[PDB]
């Protein structure tokens, strides 16, 4: 049986403030820039539709230097931090970014048509761009988040598999890391393994996995450590309706239509796909630059940061403007030529985080020791995530008890 943390955790009246100064990231919005001979990255990939996972490290309160010590007994008490307030400051102006493919697989525009496509070609690919759906989300926890996507499965060995067959599909749960791609209006699938022509989705997702958070599995966890708080807001609509070009994997049944003649002797493509569009960004619909108070979590864990560790996941596509840069090769010409200038694309992104923490103490009795050991063995030993990449935040040297000297501390003292 799982019990709430409010039973075996005692909260004191000591509060601390923590915060980062400013985080910046500048890079190419579509692909990394790499040296031709080498494999070392010169310009990383920074996009507005990437998961931002911050892993925050806290001081050990047992070894922390407090002006007063009489409030607890080190012989039978142990200390831990609790989160009571978070703000995610978000710079840059509001904007919308677009992406596309120079060789995207589009056959025809089927929204309105007046002639029939009676002849097939060798290459019908086009240069198409669009803007993605609108999404904001924030997740806070003490364990890394969990996402889901569609991937290939293991086929049965009863019958053989011929080239060109439909791959089998299964649903896969993984851990979201820093730099992953969010859904853009095409689904949560592995585009590298489920698409072979490399020309069906834009350039920044054509060789990546799009993942969606697994809210149902996260909230059903018995201990509720992976999610203390979450906000989400997403929207989209359809702008264009197209076809796809290729060979027909599955034929239309003969009892759904009447055969034609002349131009309509053969059938056109039935692999319709839409073009997504986020509508419009406004200041009134923003979930950032606002303080969140963590009064009572939904799960049994109520903001206790076991292991001196915090995880913050952020997605915000409402500031995704890409900047165009131009450099002149030769300036000794008074008439414009296309070949005298070079074009570049850049994206910059700005972050700020600030937190209010409360000090708690735990009495280690035999029953409490047994329960905590059953919950997590490493906690007692201290008194794994080495193959994942997160944005590391080190707050071991940024705490202050002067709570009213900071913007978030003033609000915290004002609400109470």
């Amino acid at each position, epitope marked *: 049986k799982v019990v709430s943390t409010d039973e075996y955790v005692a909260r004191t009246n000591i509060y601390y403030h923590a915060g980062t100064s400013r985080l910046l990231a500048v890079g190419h919005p579509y692909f990394p820039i790499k040296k031709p001979n080498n494999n070392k990255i010169l310009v990383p990939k920074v996009s507005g539709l990437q998961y931002r996972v911050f892993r925050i490290h806290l001081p050990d309160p047992n070894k922390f230097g407090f002006p007063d010590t009489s409030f607890y007994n080190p012989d039978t008490q142990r200390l831990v931090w609790a989160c009571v307030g978070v703000e995610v400051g978000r710079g840059q102006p509001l904007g919308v970014g677009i992406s596309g493919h120079p060789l995207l697989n589009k056959l025809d525009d089927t929204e309105n048509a007046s002639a029939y496509a009676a*002849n*097939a*070609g*060798v290459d019908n690919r086009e240069c198409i761009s669009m803007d993605y759906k609108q999404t904001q989300l924030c997740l806070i926890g003490c364990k890394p988040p969990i996402g889901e996507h569609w991937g290939k499965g293991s086929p049965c060995t009863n019958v053989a598999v011929n*080239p060109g067959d439909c791959p089998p599909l299964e649903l896969i749960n993984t851990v979201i890391q820093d730099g992953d791609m969010v859904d853009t209006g095409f689904g949560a699938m592995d585009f590298t393994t489920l698409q072979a022509n490399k020309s069906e989705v834009p350039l920044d997702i054509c060789t990546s996995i799009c993942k969606y958070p697994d809210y149902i599995k996260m909230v059903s966890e018995p201990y509720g450590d992976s999610l203390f708080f979450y906000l989400r807001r997403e929207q989209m609509f359809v702008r264009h309706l197209f076809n796809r070009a*290729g*060979a*027909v994997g*599955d*034929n*239309v049944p003969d009892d759904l239509y009447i*055969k034609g*003649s*002349g131009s309509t*002797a*053969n*059938l*056109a493509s039935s692999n319709y796909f839409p073009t997504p569009s986020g509508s419009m960004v406004t200041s009134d619909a923003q979930i950032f630059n606002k303080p969140y108070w963590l009064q009572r979590a939904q799960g049994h864990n109520n903001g206790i940061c076991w292991g001196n560790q915090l995880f913050v996941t952020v997605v915000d596509t409402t500031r995704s403007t890409n900047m165009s840069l131009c450099a002149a090769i030769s300036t000794s010409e008074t008439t414009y030529k296309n070949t005298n200038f070079k074009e570049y694309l850049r994206h910059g992104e700005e972050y700020d985080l600030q937190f209010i923490f409360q000090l708690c103490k735990i009495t280690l009795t035999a029953d409490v020791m047994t329960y905590i050991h059953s919950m997590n063995s490493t906690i007692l030993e201290d008194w794994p995530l080495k193959k994942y990449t997160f944005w590391e935040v080190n707050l071991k040297e940024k705490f202050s008890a002067d709570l009213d000297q900071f913007p978030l501390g003033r609000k915290f003292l004002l609400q109470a």
Partner: antibody
Amino acid sequence: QVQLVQSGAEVKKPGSSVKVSCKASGGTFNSYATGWVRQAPGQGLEWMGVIVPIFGTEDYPQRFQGRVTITADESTATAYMELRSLRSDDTAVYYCARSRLGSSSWFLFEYWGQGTLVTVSS
Amino acid sequence: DIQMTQSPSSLSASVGDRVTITCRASDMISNYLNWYQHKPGEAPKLLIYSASSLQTGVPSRFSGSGSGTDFTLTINNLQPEDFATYYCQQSYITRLSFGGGTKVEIK
């Protein structure tokens, strides 16, 4: 240029099934539409079936539905024709007609096989 | 399906003559007609497609014209290599069909 090569002559008994192949040898083909024709001793030409893998088309005449199957393999560029429930009137010479992608229509059958003789008798 | 009728079924001509073959369709098939030439011991060979267009590598002495339900093939200045069997073919629907065939012979 490209040449289509067909399998050898077949001798079958009534009630059996036969299968004939058609392979493109020179260059790279990238076939467009495949069809089969036949000629009986002392008769004309009879269309027996067409497949157009693009557009997903597969059509056979009414008198031949249920006994004729036409298949194409793009990895090896080989066409196959299957006849079931052979009769004594199926003794004939069979021709493989194919069209290449990049032409102006699907019915520009400019490539033909040499023909295969099939004799159904006991 | 569509039935096609080819006339005549046989004719005799001499070198240097003009030969016309008429082809009639059971329905309106626009210009979806092709003409094929067949010789003994060889595969059929395409001459005219879409009832007007001339296949590459074919002498200009061959011509074809028609539309609707009536079509015709004309051969001017007949040569010794033109003596073969000629067939219609409709491609209006994906269930294609052939004509009866006309055999040209030596007078």
